[PDB]
Amino acid sequence: MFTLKIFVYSCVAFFCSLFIFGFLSNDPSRNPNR
Amino acid sequence: MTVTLERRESTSLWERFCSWITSTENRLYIGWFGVLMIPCLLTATTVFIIAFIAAPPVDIDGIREPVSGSLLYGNNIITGAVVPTSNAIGLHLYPIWEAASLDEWLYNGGPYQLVVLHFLLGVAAYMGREWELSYRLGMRPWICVAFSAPVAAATAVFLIYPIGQGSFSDGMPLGISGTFNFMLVFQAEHNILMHPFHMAGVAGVFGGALFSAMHGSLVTSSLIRETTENESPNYGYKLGQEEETYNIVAAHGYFGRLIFQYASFNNSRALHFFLGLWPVVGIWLTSIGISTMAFNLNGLNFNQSIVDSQGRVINTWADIINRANLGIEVMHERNAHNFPLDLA
Amino acid sequence: TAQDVRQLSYEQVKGTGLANRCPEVVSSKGKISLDKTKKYKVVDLCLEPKQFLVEEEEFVDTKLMTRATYTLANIEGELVNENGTWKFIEKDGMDYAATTVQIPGGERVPFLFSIKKLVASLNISTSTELGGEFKVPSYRTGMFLDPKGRGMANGYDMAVALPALEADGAVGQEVLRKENDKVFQETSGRIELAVNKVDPTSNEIGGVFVSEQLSDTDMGAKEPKKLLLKGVFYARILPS
Amino acid sequence: RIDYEGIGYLGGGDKIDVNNANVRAYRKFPGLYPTAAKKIVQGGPYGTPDDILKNPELSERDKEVIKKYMDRFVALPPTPEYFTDRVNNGIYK
Amino acid sequence: IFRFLLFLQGFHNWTLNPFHMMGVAGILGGALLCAIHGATVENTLFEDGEASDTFRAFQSEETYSMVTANRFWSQIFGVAFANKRWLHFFLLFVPVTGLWVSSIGIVGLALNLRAYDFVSQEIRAAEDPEFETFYTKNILLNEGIRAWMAAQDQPHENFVFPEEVLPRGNAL
Amino acid sequence: WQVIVQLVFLALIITTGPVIIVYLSTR
Amino acid sequence: QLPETYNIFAPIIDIMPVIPILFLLLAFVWQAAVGFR
Amino acid sequence: GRSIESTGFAWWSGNARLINLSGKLLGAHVAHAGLIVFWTGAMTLFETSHFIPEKPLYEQGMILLPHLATLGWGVAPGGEIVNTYPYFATGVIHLVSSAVLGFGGIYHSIVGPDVLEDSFSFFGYDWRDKNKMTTILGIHLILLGIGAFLLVIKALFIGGIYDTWAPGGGDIRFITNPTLNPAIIFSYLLKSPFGGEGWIVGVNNMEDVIGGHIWIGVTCVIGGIWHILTRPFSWARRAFVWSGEAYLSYSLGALALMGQTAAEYAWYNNTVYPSEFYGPTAAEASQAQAFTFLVRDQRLGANIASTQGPTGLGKYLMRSPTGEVILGGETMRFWDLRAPWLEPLRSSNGLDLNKIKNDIQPWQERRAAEYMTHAPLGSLNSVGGVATEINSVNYVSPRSWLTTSHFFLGFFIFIGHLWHAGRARAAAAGFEKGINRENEPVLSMRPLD
Ligand code: CLA
Ligand code: CLA
Ligand code: CLA
Ligand code: CLA
Ligand SMILES: CCCCCCCCCCCCCCCC(=O)OC[C@H](COP(=O)(O)OC[C@@H](O)CO)OC(=O)CCCCCCCCCCCCCCC
Ligand SMILES: CC1=C(/C=C/C(C)=C/C=C/C(C)=C/C=C/C=C(C)/C=C/C=C(C)/C=C/C2=C(C)CCCC2(C)C)C(C)(C)CCC1
Ligand SMILES: CC1=C(/C=C/C(C)=C/C=C/C(C)=C/C=C/C=C(C)/C=C/C=C(C)/C=C/C2=C(C)CCCC2(C)C)C(C)(C)CCC1
Ligand SMILES: CC1=C(/C=C/C(C)=C\C=C/C(C)=C/C=C/C=C(C)/C=C/C=C(C)/C=C/C2=C(C)CCCC2(C)C)C(C)(C)CCC1
Ligand code: OEX
Ligand SMILES: [Ca+2]
Ligand SMILES: [Cl-]
Ligand SMILES: [Fe+3]
């Protein structure tokens, strides 16, 4: 049960980090008028 | 130096990743909001399917009386559902790793909580995703607002109402019959029919269907002859063409003669704005109604409002609907109540 | 651990799971005096199961479904020496707990862990042992209703969803008689505690308990199963 | 159960089954509720109605009122179905 | 009208009727189509003016980009419209069909030919007092509705239900 | 008699708005 | 209640909180007076 | 410009004409603040005017007076409203100030200059000027910190605040030793929002409240100084949209979140929202019913710790999933409740059965009766009770009004956030007015299949 918690925590932290740092990578520049 | 910082970062690995994520060349767009959406909706979907088919009965009202919701336990499509988590748990977070076993988890209704949370997350991310693709394709960004209405409804019945009532066991069951149950109990305890916001919602959906049928019939009526007899008139339109496929003036004229001249729209942009606006506002209001009734600000109460000179009550239709409400109230969850007032 | 629990606050215990655990006695020496002339009273009786065995056609191990809501506590009784033999007569307290286990195969076995109306003869030192018989009421009571609105003290008296069945003379809904005639079935499991720790200064006893008992019958619709609970107990001796 | 012979002695009749009826029934006879009814239930069951008066912790007021309504009582065999709910039987209004 | 509603629920189990379900599909689907078409057209508009007020900037030329819309919904939802004529017919068809179907249902109820029960679950529940679904729960709800309102809603019948025969749960 | 006072005050405020608008509409 | 002095100012206060709403409405009046709305 | 031709916006979207007009925009903000303070004063005087001495606040439809009473004005031990004059004082002050802010508003809106960048340089700004914006942000942050310290000062030195947990019933108390320990405060911050946890809504003592405001005061002041004397880093400059509408959208999201949080505070918390003034919570009322009938039936001679309900669970007393002794029935969901009238009966393992049998006080029974009979349930037309209840009691709990209204507000404010954020992006990139017929992106893309 603890290992499952570790797994899920790893996944959540992973995708959350990708989300946050992803949207910080100059997202307004990602448009067809650039 | 203005608003947007127009600049790049030179074929880096992380930049390549960001490029692929935000790629508009993918068959299905996978933005950052999709980086949230895809795993959430996948987990939610897997657990939902598996549970809807093979999950053991769930003690929804915490009174040690498990309700059967899966197909392999005597349900059909109409009666099958994912039973809401136990009232003994309330609003406590109940992940699998907080249970002693998967069996316990299944008994207390963990699947429901998991599915609901993941679904709400993934659907919010779906909304954000609609915005995102709109931005990537150089569109106007207000489709996600329109979609914000249904998200609000889902959030109302799966999260806010459990919060106001103090238990996820009051959340809407993931199933047809369960949904009907939710509706009936809700009527008994909030008199939602007599709530003006629900009336607004009914106006939104009835009106939405009305305007859908109306717009559809009007445009279909004024289609320009581009096709042979007995052939599908749809073949008279080609994807990407610039020429309009119907006589807008003829439609406006018809509508103008149907009611009166100034009742009709001339601006198609205005018309479609209205088409988008009416049901979205309706649903917005109904969602708010479900949440605010989630904090027990119930529908209008006209029970015994009319009295005669002597002081005797003269019933109205509100009193009859109150009789039905009473029926549902006294009959629902027969073994759950120990005290005369239902405050939870 | 009783002093430890006394020192702990509610916010320190709430959620930890300690609230369902029985206190321990850190002493295996000394004896509690018992004048066969004066009357006594066992107070703060707390059993805490650990093992739940359900017999199959030998006892097999199960899985707890209802979490930490199974331990009996604050149960109250008279300790009176009758004709020389020592008798404990249970009265008040939290002397029952509805708990559900799961046997292999998936079948849920609900039962009412009861110690009500316990009469237990005593055979107080670390060799003292407590053994005895007890009443287990019906799992549901009179006002309880089945999914079709049938119960003991209230509800429908027939299968109301089948009016065409209840429409002819003789038979009848006589078939469904077994499910239309709700019965309050008092049974008996039978316990057997067994001490092991005695603190003479604080007059506290504790040690092992075994209990046997009988279990849920769905208001007389199904046959009960034998259940087996293996645990620790705690109590205090207080003069009358 | 489907059939119960002593239903009328549960509050809706002229007489009260002391062994099974709820405390509310004793509201039928002035003086009995709540104290006398409480002591009566707490002291049950009884082989005969008169055994009520054999109960210690009964005041003289209690015994007086109880005699009166002694002519009003019956002692049917105690059935746990109703016996368990002698104080709270899930009925309010 | 609210009374008529709760009446048909309590007496006919109208929510359980598949024709009504098709009706609900028709209405909710209609509102969905209205909203999504409106929003899509409004957000795929061509810049035919300089003002932020895009309403004033409106001919045989399409005022919105069908191709862009198609692309958007294809990448979001997996499937998109491509034919304007088929689209407008579709959002004609869905709600109208809804109405017709529900009407079939109502005729059914005119003859009390209801979709009230699932005999399998009623038999199972009759034999097995531990078996419960949301269907049976709603059946109980219907029974409550019917009693209590029966006395007030049909005064000409002179229905007299003593408070001891009225179905209800504990405490309530 | 309090109701009349309330309705008079109400009338004065309510009218206060449009009067300012009309006054400035002349100039 | 209100202090005995300012007692006489009870009805006016009853209308006091309804004033912001009026301001909202006033906007429309203004617009209609101009030529828009 | 005040026309469609001169601005591009119509009379509805009329307010967008003020985006680049610093003067008139400032006028709009000041006038609006004037409206807020106006309502505060007027409504406070209304509540003081309609108040009746010998009735609880929550029976009279008061939402402002409970705040002042919570702060410790005109309150006797127990929550008795004796002096209703300081309320009148605050109302008057706010009203008159509303006259001042109103004058300033009308001035800067109609009379003064449209652009503050010409005649002035300190009060003028370009939306695209990051430094100026962070400066203003810093100033206002420092102001907020000062306000937090105003609450702290009021509670530490000037009379104190009403403490419902006060040893002797609810009474005003000067917080001698506030909580400055980061472990505790930030333990609130990093805690789950779910049952039994409650995040920051689960604060149950004024020490932690006031200490929290000390921390938030220091944080706001230090942050204000930080933003006044620094410029945004590169990553923030790259990540954010720098325009008025964008900032508006940010503040909108923030205020939506705050709206939801406030609704939850009003609904569950009874420390910052004393039940003596705001009324009981749903949880508190349900628990109050269970308590009430536990007492009634125990007085009728029932051993409640042994009383078996229809289900097999305790009729009056059972266990929580983690072992604690709790009240039975549906209110099993509300076992996380903490109320000053119940905690006397609380032990280490939950409710103390001995204290339940012996030490239940009359005032506790009165509390339970009052609260279960004033549960936050009622209709839109203020008919008290459940939906099936008849017309007799005119009552809707202040908690319901506050929570529902602020959910409404928070919700629509979130909608506004989506709207303005989207339009901010579209306007920044340059396609908020439609798709370029000569530069349609899709036409420059490879087809999907
Ligand atoms: C911090 C608050 C805030 C601020 C400063 C703004 C500011 C602005 N908004 Mg905005 N907005 C907000 C919150 C806010 N919004 C919220 C919460 C929503 C979601 C509902 C929106 C949705 C929104 C839309 C959809 C649009 C704007 C637009 C605009 C711009 C022009 C607004 C205008 O002329 O109003 C004009 C005011 C009116 C026409 C009055 C309408 C009154 C509403 C419909 C009724 C509200 C009911 C009310 C509570 C009481 C009922 C009355 C009853 C008593 C009789 C301006 C920059 C426009 C824009 O993008 O231009 C750039 C635009 O199209 N807003
Ligand atoms: C935070 C806001 C808030 C809250 C929680 C309350 C709460 C309360 N007020 Mg109060 N009030 C407020 C703001 C608020 N008020 C404002 C702004 C004013 C100035 C007009 C007043 C003036 C006022 C008076 C004069 C009185 C109260 C009274 C009351 C009490 C009874 C309320 C009642 O019957 O409501 C009635 C509720 C409604 C009519 C519902 C309103 C409908 C909403 C706005 C939706 C409609 C908008 C629409 C859907 C928007 C379209 C969406 C679009 C964007 C698409 C209650 C404690 C009464 C009392 O007992 O006090 C002692 C009383 O006499 N209030
Ligand atoms: C150092 C410069 C400075 C200072 C001191 C202020 C101060 C203020 N501005 Mg402001 N502003 C500035 C620069 C500054 N601004 C600039 C450069 C701009 C861009 C043009 C603006 C634009 C602006 C707008 C658009 C608005 C303000 C508002 C406000 C007020 C906030 C009231 C409130 O509720 O806060 C929170 C209040 C508290 C936490 C209570 C305590 C606050 C302090 C301790 C005292 C407050 C007393 C009183 C309100 C005024 C005295 C303040 C002064 C002595 C410092 C406050 C008076 C708002 C307002 O309503 O103005 C009246 C508003 O709408 N400002
Ligand atoms: C008044 C509010 C306010 C506002 C609007 C800003 C605005 C800003 N700050 Mg700032 N700041 C403030 C207060 C504020 N600050 C305070 C009070 C402090 C500390 C005293 C700071 C310290 C600070 C530093 C040190 C820096 C900024 C920076 C910035 C800029 C970048 C913002 C950013 O990327 O955020 C995004 C922020 C995050 C992703 C952080 C995540 C927050 C963590 C995870 C804690 C939250 C968890 C919490 C328990 C759960 C919240 C619940 C919620 C999620 C629902 C921006 C202009 C940066 C900048 O550009 O330099 C000037 C920078 O380096 N700020
Ligand atoms: C990560 C992203 C996840 C996205 C979510 C998944 C979306 C899945 C959508 C599937 C659409 C299937 C369309 C088939 C039919 C099909 O292929 O049509 C294709 C059709 C294309 O139309 P054209 O304009 O090309 O037609 C021109 C001529 O052929 C007309 O005759 O699309 C539409 O008509 C629009 C309506 C689709 C909307 C249909 C919604 C139905 C929802 C599903 C209902 C049942 C669910 C049961 C679940 C148990
Ligand atoms: C911009 C604009 C606008 C708006 C405006 C506004 C919003 C304004 C406001 C204003 C204001 C916000 C004002 C205020 C005022 C206030 C006042 C004027 C006050 C007074 C007070 C008094 C008078 C008091 C008295 C008393 C006392 C002293 C105490 C006792 C009682 C009594 C009552 C006696 C509009 C949209 C319309 C349009 C046009 C432009
Ligand atoms: C007073 C008080 C207290 C305290 C409090 C405090 C101390 C608080 C703090 C708080 C805090 C400290 C908060 C914070 C928050 C944060 C947030 C809320 C964040 C947000 C973020 C964002 C919004 C971002 C976004 C983004 C992304 C994610 C992507 C990229 C881009 C961007 C950047 C946009 C206590 C409890 C003791 C008690 C009660 C009272
Ligand atoms: C503080 C105070 C005061 C002041 C007051 C005030 C400030 C007032 C204001 C008032 C106002 C501020 C008013 C306003 C009003 C407004 C109005 C009255 C408007 C409108 C109405 C209507 C009815 C409209 C309608 C319409 C139009 C025309 C357009 C759209 C459509 C419709 C049809 C909706 C005095 C001196 C008494 C002294 C004592 C205290
Ligand atoms: O859980 Mn589902 O439904 Ca809301 O109310 Mn109380 O809890 Mn139960 O009764 Mn009625
Ligand atoms: Ca031994
Ligand atoms: Cl209950
Ligand atoms: Fe169209």
SS (HEC) of chain H: CCCHHHHCCCCCHHHHHHCCCHHHHHHHHHHHHHHHHHHHHHHHHHHHHHCCCCCCHHHCCCCCHHHHHHHCCCEECCCEECCCHHHHHHHHHHHHHHHHHHHHHHHHHHHCCCCCCCCCCCCCCCCCCHHHHHHHHHHHHHHHHHHHHHHHHHHHCCCCEEECCCCCCCEEECCCCCCCCHHHHHHHHCCCCCCCCCCCCCCCCHHHHHHHHHHHHHHHHHHHHHHHCCCCCHHHHHHCCCCHHHHHHHHHHHHHHHHHHHHHHHHHCCCCCCHHHHCCCHHHHHHHHHHHHHHHHHHCCCCHHHCECCCCCECCEEECCCCCEEECCHHHHHCCCCCCCCHHHEECCEECHHHHHHCCCHHHHHHHHHHHCCCCCEECCCEECCCCCCCCCECCCHHHHHHHHHHHHHHHHHHHHHHHHHHHHHHHHCCCCCECCCCCHHHHCCCCC
Asked if A15's CB is within 8 angstroms of B95's CB, the reply is no
For the stretch C103-109, contacts whose Cβ atoms lie closer than 8 Å and that sit 24 or more positions apart, written own/partner, are C103/C54, C103/C56, C103/C60, C103/C62, C104/C60, C106/B56, C108/B56, C108/B57, C108/B66, C108/B107, C108/C65, C109/C54, C109/C62, C109/C215, C109/C216, C109/C225, C109/C227
Total residues belonging to chain B: 344
Q: In this complex, do B35 and A19 lie within 8 Å of one another by their Cβ atoms?
A: yes
Q: Which of E130, H335, C97 is nearest to B59 (CA)?
A: E130
Q: Which of F5, F7, F27 to mutate to test the interface with G (most CBs of G within 10 A)?
A: F5
Which of H217, B270, B155, H124 has its CA nearest to residue E45?
Answer: B270
- Cited resolution, angstroms: 2.8
CA–centroid distance for B14 within its chain: 37
From residue A29, give the alpha-carbon distance in Å to each of B19, B138, B144, H244. Answer: 11, 12, 21, 19
Tokens at residue C230, please? 């293996």
Closest residue in chain B to residue C155, using alpha carbons only: B334
B176-187 per-residue burial string, b: 16 or more CB within 10 A, e: under 16: bbbbbbbbbbbb
Nearest CB partner across the interface for H429, out of A23, A24, A31: A31
What is the three-class DSSP state of B341?
coil
- CA C200 and chain centroid, separation: 28
Strands B174-175 and B81-82: antiparallel
Q: Using an 8 Å CB-CB cutoff, list chain D residues near E170.
A: 90
Q: Are E39 and B127 in contact (CB under 8 A)?
A: no
Q: Which of these, H429, H431, H436, H427, lies nearest to H16 by C-alpha position?
A: H427
User: How far away, in angstroms, is H207 Cα from ligand 3 center?
Assistant: 29
Ligand 8 site residues, Cβ closer than 6 angstroms: F 13-14, 16-18; G 12, 19, 22-23, 25-26, 28-29, 32, 37
Q: Residue C155 in 3-state DSSP?
A: strand
Burial class from Cβ neighbours inside 10 Å (0-12, 13-18, 19+) for residue H409 reads: middle
CA distance B86 to chain H (A): 9
The tokens for H95 are: 């009203």
Any chain C CB within 8 A of the CB of B103? yes
Secondary structure letter of residue B157 according to DSSP: I
Q: Under the phi-then-psi rule, with left for phi > 0, alpha for psi from -120 to 50, and beta for the rest, what region is E78?
A: left
Yes or no: say if E54 and H434 are a contact pair by the CB < 8 Å rule. Answer: yes
Distance from CA of B34 to the nearest CA of D (A): 53
Distance of alpha carbon B84 from alpha carbon H432, whole angstroms: 44
Ligand nearest to the CA of H109: 6
For residue B183, give both structure tokens: 């509706």
* Residue of G9, G13, G25 with the most ligand 8 atoms within 8 Å of its CB, for mutation: G25
Q: Residues with Cβ < 8 Å from F24, sequence gap 6 or more?
A: none
Q: What is the DSSP letter of B84?
A: P
Indicate the residue of A5, A22, A34 with minimum beta-carbon distance to B21: A22
Residue nearest to atom 15 of ligand 4 (CA): H223
Of B189, B203, B219, which is closest to residue B279 (Cα–Cα)?
A: B203
- Rounded CA-CA distance H435/H449 in Å is 23
F9 interfaces chain G, CB cutoff of 8 Å: yes
> Who's near C11: CB < 8 A, 6+ residues apart?
none
Pairwise CB contact (< 8 Å): B340 & D90: no
- C135-164 as b/e: b if 16+ CB within 10 A: bbbbbbbbbbbbbbbbbbbbbbebbbbbee
- Which residues fall within 8 angstroms of residue C7, CB to CB, at 6 or more apart? none
What angle is formed at CA F8 by the lines to CA F5 and CA F11, rounded to 5 degrees? Answer: 150
Least Cα separation, residue B116 to chain E (angstroms): 19
Among H94, H109, H143, residue to substitute to test ligand 3 (most atoms within 8 Å of Cβ): H143
Per the DSSP assignment, residues forming a β-bridge with D58 are none
First and final C-alpha spacing in chain E: 27
Question: Using CA atoms, how far apart are residues C139 and C137, in angstroms rounded to an integer?
Answer: 6
Query: Beta partners for C192?
Result: C210
Distance from CA of B334 to the nearest CA of D (A): 11
Q: What phi, psi does C121 have (nearest 5°)?
A: -85, 145
The method of structure determination was X-ray
CA distance linking residue B95 with residue B114, whole number of Å: 7
Cα–Cα distances in angstroms (integers) from residue E151 to residues B327, E3, E148, H389, in the given order: 11, 14, 6, 18
Torsion over CA of H377, H379, H384 and H388, rounded to 10 degrees?
A: -90
H343 annotated as a binding-site residue? yes
Helix (H, G, I), strand (E, B) or coil at C60: strand
CA B253: distance to chain centroid?
Answer: 37
Whether residue H195 contacts residue B89, with contact meaning beta carbons closer than 8 Å, is answered with yes
Q: Find the C141 Cα to ligand 4 centroid distance in Å.
A: 59
CA distance H443 to H339: 65
Neighbours of G36 (CB within 10 A): 15
Instruction: Write out residues 122-161 of B within 8 Å (CB-CB) of H.
Output: 127, 131, 134-135, 137-142, 144-145, 148, 152, 160
Instruction: Kindly state if the Cβ of H132 falls inside 6 Å of ligand 3.
Output: no
| D93 in contact with chain B, both atoms CB, cutoff 8 A | yes
Strands H378-379 and B297-298: parallel
| Distance between Cα H279 and ligand 11 center (Å) | 21
CB-CB neighbours of H13 under 10 Å = 13
> Would an 8 Å CB–CB cutoff place D81 in contact with chain H?
no
Q: Is C47 helix (H, G, I), strand (E, B) or coil?
A: strand
Separation CA C87–CA C97 (nearest Å): 24
Q: Compute the distance between CA of residue B149 and CA of residue B138 in angstroms, rounded to an integer.
A: 23
